[PDB]
Amino acid sequence: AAQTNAPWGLARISSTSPGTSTYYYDESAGQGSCVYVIDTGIEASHPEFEGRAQMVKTYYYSSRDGNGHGTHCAGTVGSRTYGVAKKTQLFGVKVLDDNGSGQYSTIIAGMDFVASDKNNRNCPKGVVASLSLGGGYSSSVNSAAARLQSSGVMVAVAAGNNNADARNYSPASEPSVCTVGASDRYDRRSSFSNYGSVLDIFGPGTSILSTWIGGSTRSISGTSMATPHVAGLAAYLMTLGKTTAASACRYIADTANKGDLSNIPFGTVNLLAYNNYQA
């Protein structure tokens, strides 16, 4: 299947060269897998989610996404027009307030919730977790991401938007999860993209058009937008049975567009997430 006039990042991860506009993807489209979006929430009422999105946990007076960031990222995972795996299930975990912020204790509690809640869900093709969030280094936030990743959930985290080495950021620096840097439409490392050896992959992260609250859309930038590109791809690849939770990050990095990226500092992998779709 193909999506014409797709957002450039959808077209990117299905192409070996930049500049293209059509998103090529196997028709399975991540059907049968679940991605837990760990963010400000999701407006599951957005027609773009087609009923395949729902809130499962909030840590605030409401589960309503009043920030838009979680709706946007869940849109990149599995929305109809702006998503990598367009038939996947979308579970909202609201550990960020409507200002985008959130305590470490809350973010750890959300990861522990997802690791348990998945045992109450129907995800025969596996469980992915998209973590569009950042913070300073924390051994405890890292332990939560590691736990969740080891409980059987493919964990994708953002490298962070600091233009620095990602080793000083959690859960970005947890060695066992998938740390995602950001790229732009001309195959450059995004100006803000954290880097370093702990990075496993780069995804489209600059000017990413996806769903937004109120039933709208808006294009924003950040390694937080590169993460749902990878989480969705992991769900897509897992549904196709090409990988599993424990190995999706490594499989995505081995199947990646190698070396295509400009301005990659020495010692950071030069891999662009790629679904390698042939029809």
UniProtKB/Swiss-Prot annotation:
Keyword annotations: Calcium, Disulfide bond, Hydrolase, Metal-binding, Protease, Serine protease, Signal, Zymogen
Binding site for Ca(2+) 2: 16, 260
Binding site for Ca(2+) 1: 175, 177, 200
GO biological process: one example: proteolysis
Active-site residues, as the UniProt record annotates them: 39 (charge relay system), 69 (charge relay system), 224 (charge relay system)
Function: Hydrolyzes keratin at aromatic and hydrophobic residues.
Protein's name in the database: Proteinase K
Species name: Parengyodontium album
Residue numbers of the full-length protein present here: 106 to 384 of 384
